[PDB]
Amino acid sequence: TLTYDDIVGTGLANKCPTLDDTARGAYPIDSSQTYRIARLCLQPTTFLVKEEPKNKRQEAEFVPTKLVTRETTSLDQIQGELKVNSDGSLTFVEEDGIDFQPVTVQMAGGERIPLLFTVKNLVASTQPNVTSITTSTDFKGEFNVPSYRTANFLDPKGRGLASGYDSAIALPQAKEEELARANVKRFSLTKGQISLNVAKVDGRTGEIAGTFESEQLSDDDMGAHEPHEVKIQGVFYASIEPA
Amino acid sequence: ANLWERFCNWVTSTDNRLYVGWFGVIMIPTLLAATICFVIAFIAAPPVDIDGIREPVSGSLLYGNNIITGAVVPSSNAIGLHFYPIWEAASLDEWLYNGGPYQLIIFHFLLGASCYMGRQWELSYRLGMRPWICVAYSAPLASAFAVFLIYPIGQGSFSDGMPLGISGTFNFMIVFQAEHNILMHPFHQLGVAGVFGGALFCAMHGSLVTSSLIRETTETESANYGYKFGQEEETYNIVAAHGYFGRLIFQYASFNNSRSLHFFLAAWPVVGVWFAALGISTMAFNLNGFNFNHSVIDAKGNVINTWADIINRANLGMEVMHERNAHNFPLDLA
Amino acid sequence: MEVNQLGLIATALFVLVPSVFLIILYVQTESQQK
Amino acid sequence: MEVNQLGLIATALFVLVPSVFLIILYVQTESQQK
Amino acid sequence: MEPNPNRQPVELNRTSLYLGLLLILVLALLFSSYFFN
Amino acid sequence: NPMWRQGMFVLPFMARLGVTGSWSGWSITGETGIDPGFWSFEGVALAHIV
Amino acid sequence: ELVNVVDEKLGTAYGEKIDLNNTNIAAFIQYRGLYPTLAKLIVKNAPYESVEDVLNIPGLTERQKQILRENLEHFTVTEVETALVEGGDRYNNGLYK
Amino acid sequence: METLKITVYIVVTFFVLLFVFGFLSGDPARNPKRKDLE
Amino acid sequence: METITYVFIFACIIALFFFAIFFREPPRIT
Amino acid sequence: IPEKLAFYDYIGNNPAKGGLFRTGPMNKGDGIAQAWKGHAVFRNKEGEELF
Amino acid sequence: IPEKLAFYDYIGNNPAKGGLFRTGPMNKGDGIAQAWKGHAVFRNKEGEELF
Amino acid sequence: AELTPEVLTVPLNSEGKTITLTEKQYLEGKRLFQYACASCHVGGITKTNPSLDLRTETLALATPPRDNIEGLVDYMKNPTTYDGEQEIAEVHPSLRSADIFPKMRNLTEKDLVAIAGHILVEPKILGDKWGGGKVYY
Ligand code: CLA
Ligand code: CLA
Ligand code: CLA
Ligand SMILES: CC(C)=CCC/C(C)=C/CC/C(C)=C/CC/C(C)=C/CC/C(C)=C/CC/C(C)=C/CC/C(C)=C/CC/C(C)=C/CC/C(C)=C/CC1=CC(=O)C(C)=C(C)C1=O
Ligand SMILES: CCCCCCCCCCCCCCCC(=O)OC[C@H](CO[C@@H]1O[C@H](CS(=O)(=O)O)[C@@H](O)[C@H](O)[C@H]1O)OC(=O)CCCCCCCCCCCCCCC
Ligand SMILES: CCCCCCCCCCCCCCCC(=O)OC[C@H](COP(=O)(O)OC[C@@H](O)CO)OC(=O)CCCCCCCCCCCCCCC
Ligand code: HEM
Ligand SMILES: CCCCCCCCCCCCO[C@@H]1O[C@H](CO)[C@@H](O[C@H]2O[C@H](CO)[C@@H](O)[C@H](O)[C@H]2O)[C@H](O)[C@H]1O
Ligand SMILES: CCCCCCCCCCCCO[C@@H]1O[C@H](CO)[C@@H](O[C@H]2O[C@H](CO)[C@@H](O)[C@H](O)[C@H]2O)[C@H](O)[C@H]1O
Ligand SMILES: CCCCCCCS[C@@H]1O[C@H](CO)[C@@H](O)[C@H](O)[C@H]1O
Ligand SMILES: CCCCCCCS[C@@H]1O[C@H](CO)[C@@H](O)[C@H](O)[C@H]1O
Ligand code: OEY
Ligand SMILES: [Ca+2]
Ligand SMILES: [Cl-]
Ligand SMILES: [Cl-]
Ligand SMILES: [Cl-]
Q1: Which Pfam families does this entry report, sorted A to Z (chain A)?
Q2: Which among B321, D32, I26, L59 counts the fewest CB atoms within 10 Å?
C-alpha cells in the first residue's frame, strides 16, 4: 500500500499495475449486466518509426528510437463503457482519462520524431461469444489522432492557425506561393489502430493485464511536413467493473 | 620532506608561472570542465526544449546559429530546479534534449569563479600584499550568481537563468524588464551609476595621469618608454594633475591624495555593481521596480499618462509576446 | 543557410590584411640591431 | 557565369599568403643593421 | 635561459622579393581560371 | 549513396580497420541502434584532437 | 490548395452568431440567462443538426426552454470544425481579457 | 551512467579532500613575514 | 563555411592567449 | 538484381571519368542516386533485341 | 497617372526602410520593378470605400 | 473635467429611480472596493474568472439585473451565477458568508451602498478601461 511519498521520483508513477503470475483465471460476463472499465492503463515500452526509403519500392521497416522526453509517456486513469454486444462480443468505448501524451523519440542520426501517443475516442471490440474474459481474450479497435499542436499554437515567427500572423512578416516583399505551406496552418485529424492481448486475468477482482501494439501517425507540424508512421508497443492494465 | 609536504609546497609555490594554490586545486578542473563542455555545446549541441513545452530552441553553430544568435540553452522548465547531471538521463540524447549542458557548465563555472576569488585572496597572502582585490572581484562574481543561480531559485527553474549566448542575454534582459520593470528599480539605477561612473572615472584618471606625464622622451618615440618597470620614482606629476582638475571644477572637488583617489576608483564601480547584483537577486523574489502606472489622475478621474505609463505599454508588449505558447492561465506568476 | 557569399572573403581579408601588417612590423622590429 | 564559389577566396589566399611571407622576409632583411 | 647557439639570421634581398612576387602573381594569373572553373 | 559517392576521404580509413559506428546510433553498414562504444568516428576524431 | 479553416469559417454564419456546434462557451455570456447553466448543457449536447434541436436537450425546465426560444435568433449551426473543438477549446480557448 | 556517476563522485571527493587537507597543512605559516601563527 | 570561419577565429584567439601568456616579452626591472 | 550491384555497373562510378578541377563529391556531378530505373532492353520493329 | 509618379508613392523607395548590413541595390530587396499593378480600391459588403 | 453630481448620479433600481452619491460616498466606495474586492476585481475585471467583468452593460445583462444599486447590494449579500441559477456565497465574498470571508464582517449596509456606487460610477469616469484589462492600460 504505497503512498505518494513512497513513489515520488522513482519512476513507478509512469508504470501500469501488474498482475501476479497466478492471474490466469476467467472473469465471467453476465450478458444482462452492464459493465465499465474503471481504469485503463497503457505503458509504452518501445516506440518504432517506419523509415522512409528513397526508391519508394523498397520494403520499408520499423526501426527503434531513443526516448528523450523521459518517463512522461503512459496513458492512465482512462475509463469508459464496456458494452456486451448481441453476438457476445464486448466493446470498450473510451469516455475520458489521461489518454494522450506528447512524446519525442530520436532516430539514429538524430532526427527527432514528436507524436501524440494516444487512444482518444478509442472504440475497441473483442471476438464474439466472450462469456468470460480470459487469457485468450483480445481487443482490437480504432482511435482518433488530432493535431499534435492545437489551434492556438504559434511557430517561431509567430504564425498560427486560430491565432498569429498569416504571412512571413520578416520577408515583406517575398513571393507568397513558395511560403504557402508554411504560412497557412492546417489541423490534421487521422485514425490510429490498436490491439490489446490479455496475458493475465484476476477473475475475482476483474483485473486484466497484457501487451498492446498501436499504430498511428506522428506530428506533421500543423501541415508543414509529412507525418511519420509510428508503432508503439507496451503493456496495459485494466480494471473491469459491474456498472 | 615527505611526498605530501613537497606537493603542498608546489601547490602553494610563489614561483609557478600561474599560481595554483588550494583554491586553484578546485578552480582548475571545474573551469576546464565548464570550458570544454561550453565550447563543444556551443558548436555542436542539438536544440533544447528550454520552456518544457516540446518546443526545442537551437543554440549551436552547426544547427543554424552564428556568433550573435548562438547560445548554450538553459535547461527545461520540466526540470525546474531539479539537479540534472549526465547520469540522471537515460542517454546523452535525452540529456541534450533537456538542456543538461547548461547545468553542467553553470555549476562548474560558479564553483570555479568562486575559487578564482578565493585564489586572488591566496596569492595576495603569499606575496605579502593587502588582501582586498578579491573583494573588488566579488562584484562581477555576485552578478554572475544573480543571473545563473539566484534568479532561477526565486523563479523556481534554471530555465529562467540567463542563457549562455549574446542574443540569449538580450532575451533575458527584455523578459526581465517585462516582469520586474528593472529600469525603474533603484538598485539597477545604482548599477548604471556604477558602470557609467566607472567609465567616466576610468577615462578621467587615465587622461589626468596621461596629461601629467613627466617628459622623459623625444618626439620621435613613444612616451611609454619614459617609464621603466620597477622604477621607484612616480611617472607623472600628481601636483600638476590636481592643479588642473581642481581648477576644472574647484579645488576641493579634486583629490590631492593618490591613495584616496584610487580607493575611490575601486569603491564607486564595485559598490554600484554590488547594487546591480542585489537588484537582480531581489527581483529574484519579485520585489520589483517602482510602479507608477496610472499614478497621475485629473479632477474627474481621467488617467493622465506620464512617461512611466509609456514604459508600461512597452513592458506590456514584451509580456504578452514572451514564450508565446508556454502560458495557459491569465497570470504569469513565475 | 542562405548566407552572403562575400561574407567569407570579407572576414578573411578583414583578418589577414591588418594581422599581416602587424606581423611585418613586428618581425622587422625584432631583426633590428640589439 | 556559374563559376565555382570558392574560386575567389582560393585565388585571393593563393596570392596573399606567399606574397606576405616574402614581404615579411624582405622587410626584416632591410631593417637588419649594416 | 642559455641562448641557443644554433640560431641564424634570415635574408631575402629585393631581387628575390621581385622574383618571388612575380612567380606568385603569374602562378595565380595562370591557375585562377581553373579555380573559378 | 555510400561514403565514396560523398567525397569522403578519412571515413573509409576509419572503417577499414573497424570503426564503423556513430555515437548518434547509425553505422556505415546501415544498421540502427548500434553502440559503437567510445571508438566511434567521433571518438576517433576527438582522440586525434587531444 | 491551402486554406486557414478558421478564417474561412469567419465568412459563414459562425462569424455572425453563436455557433452551437463550434463557438467557445464564453460567447453565451453575450445574452441574458444563457451562462453558465444553459451554455454548459448546449456545449455538452453538441452538435446539433439545426438550432431548434437545442430545445430537445433532455432535462430542460420550461423556463430554460423559454430562454432558449427567446435566443434562437442569436444562434446558428455549422459543420463541426475540428480545429475549434479539439483541445477542450470550447471550454477554454486561451483567451482571457 | 552508474559508472560515470561513481567516477565523478570519486574524482570530486579526491579534489575536495585535497582542498581541505591542503588548507589544514599549516597554511597561515605559508606567507613571507610572520610564520608563527599557531 | 560560416561555422568553420567562427570556430577558426575562436581557435586563433585561444592560440593567441597561449603565446601572449607563455611567450610574452618578460617584464624586466631597471 | 540488387540495386547495389546494378549501381556498380554504371560509368558515373568509374574513377577514371573525372577532371582535375571538377571538385567535390561524385554526387555534385551526376547527382545523388535515388533508384535503379531497371534494366533497359532495346528492340527494333522486328523484335530483335539491340545492345 | 504616370507609372513613375505611382512608383514614387511606394515605401520600397523610401530611403528610411533599409538595414546596415542589407547590402547592395534596392533591386536585391523587393526586386526589379516591372509594372504598376494599378490603384487598389477596397470596399466592404455595403460598398463603402475602405482605406 | 470634474467629478460632478451628474457623474455621481446612478440607477438606484430597475424602475428608473436614481440616487446621487456624495463625493465622500465616492471616496468611501473606492476605499471599500480596494479593501474587499480589488484583489480579484482590480480595474473592473475578474482575475479568477476573466469571462465576467464589472462593466455596466455586463451587469445589466446579468440575472437578476446588477446594473443598479439594489442589484449590487443584493449581490454582495447573496451572490449568484450570471444566470441567477446558483447561489455562490460559498466561493464568493458576501455578508452571508462573512464567516468564511472575514473582510465582509465589518461591512455595513452603508458600506455595501458605497461599493455599489463605486462599481457603477467608475466606468462613467474611465470608460473602456473599466473591465478592459491590460489592452486598455
Ligand atoms: C575540482 C574538482 C571537481 C568538482 C568540485 C566538480 C563538481 C561537480 N561536478 Mg564535475 N568533473 C570534474 C571535476 C570536478 N567537478 C572532472 C575532472 C570531470 C571529468 C572526469 C568532471 C565530470 C563531470 C560530469 C560529467 C558531471 C560533473 C558534475 C559535477 C557537479 C555534481 C558533482 C556531484 O554530484 O558530486 C557529489 C559528491 C559528493 C557530494 C562527495 C563529496 C563528499 C566530501 C568528502 C564532503 C562533502 C563536501 C561538502 C558538502 C562541501 C564542502 C565544504 C568545503 C568548505 C570544504 C558538481 C558541480 C555533474 C553536473 O554538472 O550536473 C549538472 C555532471 O553531470 N562533473
Ligand atoms: C592526400 C591528399 C588529399 C586527397 C587525395 C583528398 C581527397 C578529397 N578531398 Mg580532401 N583535404 C585534404 C587532403 C586530401 N583530400 C587537405 C590537406 C585538406 C585541408 C585543406 C582537405 C580538406 C577538404 C575539404 C574541405 C573537402 C575535401 C574534399 C575531398 C574530396 C574531393 C577532392 C577535390 O575536389 O580535389 C580537388 C583537387 C584539385 C583542384 C587539385 C589541386 C592542385 C593544386 C592546386 C596544384 C598546385 C600547383 C602548384 C601551385 C604549382 C607550383 C609550381 C612551382 C613549383 C614552380 C576528395 C575525396 C571535398 C569533399 O567532398 O568532402 C566531403 C571537400 O569539400 N578535402
Ligand atoms: C562614401 C562611401 C560610399 C557609399 C555611401 C557607397 C554606396 C554604395 N555602394 Mg560603394 N564603394 C565604395 C564607397 C561607397 N559606396 C568604396 C570605397 C568601394 C571600393 C571597395 C565601393 C565598391 C562598391 C561595390 C563593389 C559595390 C558598391 C555598392 C554600393 C551601393 C550599396 C551599398 C552597400 O551595400 O553598403 C554596405 C555597407 C556596410 C555593410 C557598412 C560596413 C560597415 C563597416 C564594416 C564598419 C567597420 C567597423 C570597424 C572595423 C570598427 C573599428 C573599431 C576600432 C576603431 C576600435 C551603395 C549605393 C554595391 C552596388 O550596388 O553596386 C551597383 C556594390 O556591389 N560599392
Ligand atoms: C553672458 C554671461 C552672463 C556671461 C557670464 C560669464 C561669466 C564671467 C560668469 C561668471 C559668473 C559665473 C561663473 C556664473 C556661473 C553660473 C553657474 C552656477 C554655472 C553652473 C554650471 C554647471 C551646471 C556646473 C556643473 C559643475 C559640475 C556638474 C561639476 C561636476 C561635479 C562632480 C560629480 C565632480 C566629481 C568630483 C570627484 C569626487 C571626482 C572623483 C573621480 C575622478 C574624476 C578622479 C580622477 C582624478 C582626480 C584627481 O584629482 C587627480 C589628481 C587624478 C590623478 C585623477 O585621476
Ligand atoms: C577535451 C579533453 C582534454 C583534456 C586535456 C587535459 C590536459 C591536462 C594535461 C596537460 C599537461 C601539460 C600542461 C602544461 C601547461 C602549463 O601550464 O605549464 C606552464 C607552467 C610550467 O610548469 C612548471 O614546470 C616545471 C618543470 S618543467 O619546466 O615542465 O620541466 C616545474 O618545475 C614547475 O613547478 C611547474 O609549474 O606550469 C604552471 O605555471 C603551473 C601550473 C599551471 C596550470 C594552468 C592551468 C590553469 C587552467 C585554468 C582554466 C582555464 C580554462 C580556460 C582557458 C581559456
Ligand atoms: C600551408 C601553407 C604554406 C604557405 C607558405 C607558402 C610560402 C611559399 C613561398 C615560395 C615562394 C618562393 C619565391 C622565391 C623567389 C626567390 O627568392 O628567387 C631568388 C632566389 C635567390 O636565392 P639566393 O641563393 O641568391 O639567396 C638570396 C636570398 O635573399 C634569398 O632568401 O632563388 C630561389 O629562391 C630558388 C627558386 C627561384 C625560382 C624563382 C624564379 C621565378 C621566375 C619567374 C616565374 C614567373 C614568370 C613566368 C613567365 C612565363
Ligand atoms: C467585494 C466586496 C466584491 C464585490 C462587490 C464583487 C462584485 C462582483 C459582482 C457584481 C460580480 C458579478 C459580475 C457580473 O455579473 O458581471 C462578481 C463576480 C465574481 N467575482 Fe466578485 N466581488 C467582490 C469580491 C471578489 C473577490 C475577492 C473575488 C476573488 C476571490 C471575486 C471573484 C469573482 C468571481 C470569480 C466572479 C464570477 C462568479 C460567477 O459568476 O461564477 N470577487 N463579483
Ligand atoms: C571531508 C572532511 C575532512 C575532515 C577532516 C578533519 C580532520 C581533523 C584533524 C586534522 C589533522 C590535521 O593534520 C594535518 O596534516 C598533516 C599531518 O601529517 C600535517 O602536515 C603538514 O605539516 C606542516 C605544517 O606546517 C606543513 O608545512 C607540511 O606541508 C605538512 O606536512 C599538518 O600540519 C597537520 O596539522
Ligand atoms: C598568413 C601568412 C603568414 C606568414 C608568416 C611567416 C612568418 C615568418 C617569420 C620570419 C621570422 C624572422 O625571424 C627573425 O630573424 C631575424 C634575423 O633575420 C632575427 O634578428 C636577429 O638577427 C639579426 C641579424 O641580422 C639582428 O639584427 C637582430 O638584432 C637579431 O634579433 C629576429 O630575432 C627574428 O625574429
Ligand atoms: C569531439 C566530439 C564532437 C561532438 C560530436 C557531435 C555529436 S555526434 C553527431 O550527432 C548528430 C546528431 O545525432 C549526427 O547527425 C551525426 O551523424 C553525428 O556525428
Ligand atoms: C574522454 C571521454 C571518455 C569517455 C569514455 C566513455 C566510455 S563508454 C564505454 O566504453 C567501452 C569501451 O569503448 C565500451 O565497450 C562500452 O560499451 C561503453 O559504454
Ligand atoms: O517569463 Mn514570464 O514568467 Ca519567468 O516563466 Mn513565466 O513566463 Mn516563463 O519561463 Mn522563462 O519566463
Ligand atoms: Ca493472450
Ligand atoms: Cl521569450
Ligand atoms: Cl500557465
Ligand atoms: Cl467582453
Answers
A1: MSP
A2: I26
